[PDB]
């Protein structure tokens, strides 16, 4: 309810302040690849990012206005999408590779050695290049990530009550605010009115691709049975 009063600039500031850090790996690049070893590294990295993501979520405006059940649900719905949009963002200036960590790059030859990973790899790459070509800005990125958090779980369940409808509408109002904020950023960047809604659409359509990759990824995750307790739990939500 306080978050509905935030201005565009205040929304950007809050989201930038809440940004999780880019984490490193224990990766040793001086020995031959091993599929089991790389999976372990990716799982460990993902697990550490999730803890940062959960605390970031609490700092997204409007999020803590939700009950525990809804906060939990949103995080369960969007966790892999949020990891993935982070990966494609930090992979931007590095064509041909996924920058899992500054000190853990996965190249395409090596991704081929991961059974069934190359298709998802190429999609992640295409998405990162897309962003690089669009010259996606950090301010736009943090808006998109917040949008994924709030939006991905909002249509899972029917509302049975007016109360439920209202909490759903609370999420929509916050989403409307981040849309306003995205447009505000584009206007302040020089974009004509047509450019602004075209850029907004292009970015939101990419979120459909991120959902797509997350679903394909989730499929492979509950197929290899590495996983931490928290990851097993997050995965369980989709299974």
């Amino acid at each position: 309810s306080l978050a509905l009063s935030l201005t565009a600039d205040q929304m950007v500031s809050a989201l930038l302040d809440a940004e999780p850090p880019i984490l490193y790996s224990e990766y040793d690049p001086t020995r031959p690849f091993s599929e089991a070893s790389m999976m372990g590294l990716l799982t460990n990295l993902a697990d550490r990012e999730l803890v940062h993501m959960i605390n970031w979520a609490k700092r997204v405006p409007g999020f803590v206005d939700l009950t525990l059940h809804d906060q939990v649900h949103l995080l369960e719905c969007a966790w892999l999408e949020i990891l993935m949009i982070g990966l494609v963002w930090r992979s931007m200036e590095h064509p041909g590779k996924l920058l899992f960590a500054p000190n853990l790059l996965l190249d395409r030859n090596q991704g081929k050695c991961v059974e069934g990973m190359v298709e998802i790899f190429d999609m992640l790459l295409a998405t990162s290049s897309r962003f690089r070509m669009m010259n996606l800005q950090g301010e736009e990125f943090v808006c998109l990530k917040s949008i994924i958090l709030l939006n991905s779980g909002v249509y899972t369940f029917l509302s049975s009550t007016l109360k439920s409808l209202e909490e759903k509408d609370h999420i929509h109002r916050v989403l409307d605010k981040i849309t306003d904020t995205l447009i505000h950023l584009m206007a302040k960047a020089g974009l004509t009115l047509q450019q602004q809604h075209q850029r907004l659409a292009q970015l939101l359509l990419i979120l459909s691709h991120i959902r797509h990759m997350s679903n394909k990824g989730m499929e492979h995750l509950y197929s290899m049975k590495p996983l931490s307790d928290l990851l097993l739990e997050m995965l369980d939500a989709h299974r």
Partner: peptide, 10 residues
């Protein structure tokens, strides 16, 4: 509780 629940409750 779920682990996710606990990590929020911190």
């Amino acid at each position: 509780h779920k682990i996710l629940h606990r990590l929020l409750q911190d």
